[PDB]
Amino acid sequence: SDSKEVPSLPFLRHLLEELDSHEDSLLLFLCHDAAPGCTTVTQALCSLSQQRKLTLAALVEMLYVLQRMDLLKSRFGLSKEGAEQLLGTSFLTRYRKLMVCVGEELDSSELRALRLFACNLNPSLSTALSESSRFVELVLALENVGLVSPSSVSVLADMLRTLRRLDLCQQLVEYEQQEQARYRYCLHH
């Protein structure tokens, strides 16, 4: 394999010192499928390294999703457009990236309403959610009881529609339709 496409871990751990706790949570969520059981970003990166999934493209996509254009420039010499050329070319899935982005378009009041909608749909979720739960944590909670998955996000779309955020609802409906079409007629990132 070409080592050029694999940044060294030390270079990465140093990069991590630039992210705060919220950003760490978002990255851990992005690595949920590939790095199971991990609780720290360091663990997730090590797991990805072991699988040779921690490529230049993967890191660039992570930084782009986190909107850290400062780090894309300083660490990879890439402008926003340069980074966009790499989107969809790593292990990262459109499902996970979309969920992170939608979460960043919600304010605390909207997030609170969504958590309440979820607990009303399934009261069992109350023990997995609190007033400090982030959107990505709400998504994982829904996934863990089978309400949503990478192939089905209509429950979340419905919740967003109830919130009157038809714009976010539409992004999820369109994603589900795109994923369905890809699976059915192509047998995504």
Domain ranges of the chain: 1-89, 90-189
Structure token pair of residue 39: 């609780």
- Taking alpha carbons only, the member of 140, 160, 135 closest to residue 150 is 140
**Fold classification of 90-189 (topology level):** Death Domain, Fas (1.10.533)
Q: What is the resolution of this structure in A?
A: 1.2
CB under 8 Å to 25, separation ≥6 — which residues? 134, 136, 137
The C-alpha atoms of residue 39 and residue 133 are separated, in whole angstroms, by 16
Residue type (1 letter), 89: T
Exposure on the CB side of residue 123, measured as CA atoms within 13 A: 0
Structure token pair of residue 86: 């790499």
Residue type (1 letter), 76: F
> Dihedral, CA atoms, 36, 37, 41, 42, nearest 10 degrees?
-100
Q: Do residues 25 and 134 lie in contact, with contact meaning Cβ atoms separated by under 8 Å?
A: yes
Structure token pair of residue 131: 């007033």
Strand partners, 152: 149
CB under 8 Å to 122, separation ≥6 — which residues? 145, 147
Structure token pair of residue 135: 């959107």
3-state secondary structure of 149: strand
Q: Do residues 59 and 12 lie in contact, with contact meaning Cβ atoms separated by under 8 Å?
A: yes
3-state secondary structure of 44: helix
Cα dihedral sign for 90, 59, 85, 94? positive
What dotted CATH number matches 1-89? 1.10.533.10
Query: Quick one: which H or E segment has residue 171?
Result: helix 166-186
Structure token pair of residue 160: 């967003």
Q: Tell me 163's DSSP state.
A: T
The C-alpha atoms of residue 44 and residue 110 are separated, in whole angstroms, by 29
Distances (CA, A) of 136 to 51, 73, 85, 101: 24, 26, 25, 10
